[PDB]
Amino acid sequence: ATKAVAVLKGDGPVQGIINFEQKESNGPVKVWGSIKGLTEGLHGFHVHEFGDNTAGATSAGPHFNPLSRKHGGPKDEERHVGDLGNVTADKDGVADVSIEDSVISLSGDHAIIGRTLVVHEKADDLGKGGNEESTKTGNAGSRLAAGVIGIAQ
Amino acid sequence: ATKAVAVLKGDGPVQGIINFEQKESNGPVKVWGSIKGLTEGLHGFHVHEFGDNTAGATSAGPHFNPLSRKHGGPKDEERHVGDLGNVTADKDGVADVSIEDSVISLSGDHAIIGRTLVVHEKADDLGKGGNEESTKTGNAGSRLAAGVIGIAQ
């Protein structure tokens, strides 16, 4: 029933399109698409609380974390709602995404419609990097590309 | 209060930032901001049903019309939910937007959050254009700039 999409865009080579689908409001959200222009390896993949309020915004903005948990991996009970972990780019810089998440939703309090999907500069350390910043952002670094999550055809 | 924001982006010089605010969930939505890079005169200003599912999309898709009405002006009872009429650009090509609307909402089943705000090539004829396309789109023409309506800080 509920379907959504984010077009990932930035001031750079990184671009992609990520689809969200959730057949029942109690069910998982299937997340699939691909991102190109990435450096080989892992890149943080997070939902941030707000849409851009400026042209050519560089900041990622706060993580989507309505329950005020510490940053973790998507498998962890202790995590932000928006903690979707890492996408993996191949040697050509293409990252094909195919995950399922039961913490994000496309409806209700934890709805990510109207929020921002961001692929990050560096790998998300999943809260296990051993410093204060690890429990906030996973040390994923800067926003390479982002898109507001919108309703999809 | 519910707040939203759309960053209107295009290929040409047309760009803008439009804010939405709704003090009461059954009250009017305040729409304000500014658009620049426009030709002097009236430009169609509509909420469309879907967010882009492609990079560099040139088409504004279907109008957001969940109640299946005919196209009209914002003051008409016969209108789409997304029929916000026209904005007016001065001789410097800048349109100061200051609207209030009681058909659109930022919440509920027919919330515009996650939909696309689009500024169009030419004036909306408000359904009074004298052909079939008039009662569908108001003949406002191509999309000049667009943005997904996201949640605002």
Laid out side by side, the sheet with B2-8 consists of B95-101, B29-36, B15-22, B2-8, B150-151
How many domains does one find in chain A? Answer: 1
Do B109 and B81 contact (CB within 8 A), yes or no? no
A63 is in an annotated binding site: yes
Residues of B in contact with A55 (CB under 8 A): 7, 9, 15, 17
Q: Determine the length of chain A.
A: 153
Catalytically annotated residue among B43, B63, B79, B115 = B63
Catalytically annotated residue among A43, A79, A83, A124 = A83
Which residues is A88 bridged to in the sheet? A42
Three-state DSSP class for residue A137: helix
A49 interfaces chain B, CB cutoff of 8 Å: yes
Cβ neighbours, 10 Å, residue B67: 9
Q: Nearest-CA neighbor of B43 among B19, B67, B68, B10?
A: B10
DSSP 8-state assignment for residue B136: H
Q: Nearest-CA neighbor of A47 among A123, A110, A131?
A: A110
Three-state DSSP class for residue B135: helix
Which residues is A129 bridged to in the sheet? none
Instruction: Kindly state the tokens that stand for B14.
Output: 């047309």
Phi, psi torsion values for B101, nearest 5 degrees: -140, 140
Q: State which amino acid sits at residue A39.
A: T
Note whether B7 contacts A150, CB cutoff 8 Å.
no
State the Cα–Cα distance between residues A58 and A36, nearest whole angstrom.
19
Which residues is B34 bridged to in the sheet? B17, B96
Among B32, B36, B113, which would you mutate to test the A interface (most chain A Cβ atoms within 10 Å of its Cβ)? B113
Experimental method: X-ray
Note whether A50 contacts B148, CB cutoff 8 Å.
no
Tell me whether residue B111 is exposed, middle or buried, using C-beta atoms within 10 angstroms of its C-beta: 0 to 12, 13 to 18, 19 or more: buried
Q: State which amino acid sits at residue A150.
A: G
What is the full DSSP assignment across A70-133?
PP--TT-SSS-TTEEEEEEE-TTS-EEEEEEESS-BSSSTTB-TTSEEEEESS---TT-SSSTT
Note whether B51 contacts A9, CB cutoff 8 Å.
no
Do A7 and A140 contact (CB within 8 A), yes or no? no
Q: In the annotation, is B110 catalytic?
A: no
State the Cα–Cα distance between residues A43 and A141, nearest whole angstrom.
9
B63 is in an annotated binding site: yes
Residues of A in contact with B149 (CB under 8 A): 51, 114, 148
Note whether B151 contacts A115, CB cutoff 8 Å.
yes
Distances (CA, A) of A91 to A8, A42, A104, B13: 20, 11, 30, 36
Residues of A in contact with B116 (CB under 8 A): 150
User: Which domain range does residue A141 map to?
Assistant: 1-153
Q: Residue B40: give its domain's CATH number.
A: 2.60.40.200
A17 interfaces chain B, CB cutoff of 8 Å: yes
- The H or E element that residue B137 is part of is helix B134-137
B22 interfaces chain A, CB cutoff of 8 Å: no
Distances (CA, A) of A108 to B50, B109, B137: 19, 11, 32
Catalytically annotated residue among B43, B83, B115, B125 = B83
| β-pair type (A15-22, A41-48) | unpaired
Note whether B55 contacts A148, CB cutoff 8 Å.
no
Q: What residues contact residue B8 under an 8 Å CB cut-off, 6+ apart?
A: B14, B15, B16, B17, B18, B35, B117, B118, B119, B145, B146, B147
Do B80 and B64 contact (CB within 8 A), yes or no? yes
State the Cα–Cα distance between residues B90 and B66, nearest whole angstrom.
33
- For this entry, resolution in Å reads 2.0
Among B11, B109, B151, B153, which would you mutate to test the A interface (most chain A Cβ atoms within 10 Å of its Cβ)? B151
Do B97 and B33 contact (CB within 8 A), yes or no? yes
Laid out side by side, the sheet with A143-148 consists of A83-89, A41-48, A116-120, A143-148
- Most distant CA pair in chain B, distance: 43
